């Protein structure tokens, strides 16, 4: 829903890179290139961002609780 804080398998923090990754994603970077730029080489870490679905963007569409 929202970016996992840590890589499920290894424990590397991946929660502080989703916005960076989205910035990279604005450009024509392939999903692999963003990880390369962010320096995530083990596939355990790469799977974290490659497979993530940012649904929280949908969750914000709902009327707010002032």
């Amino acid at each position: 829903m929202i970016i996992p804080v840590r890589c499920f398998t290894c424990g590397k923090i991946v929660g502080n890179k989703w916005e960076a990754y989205l910035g990279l994603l604005q450009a024509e970077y392939t999903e692999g290139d963003a990880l390369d730029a962010l320096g995530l080489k083990r596939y355990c870490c790469r799977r974290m961002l490659l497979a993530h679905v940012d649904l929280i963007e949908k969750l914000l569409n709902y009327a707010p609780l002032e």
Partner: protein
């Protein structure tokens, strides 16, 4: 020591609904209301 404050649905505004008072928002009169968070202590381990 509650006048029994409830939170509206579509208004999101605290409305005072005392006992045997109809649950309707002061504004818009919508019939849906939600109880406010308990004032009782809430703590989690984050585990």
């Amino acid at each position: 020591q509650q006048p029994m404050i409830y939170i509206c649905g579509e208004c999101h505004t605290e409305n005072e609904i005392k006992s045997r008072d109809p649950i309707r928002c002061r504004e818009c009169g919508y019939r849906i209301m939600y109880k406010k968070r308990t004032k009782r202590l809430v703590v989690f381990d984050a585990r």
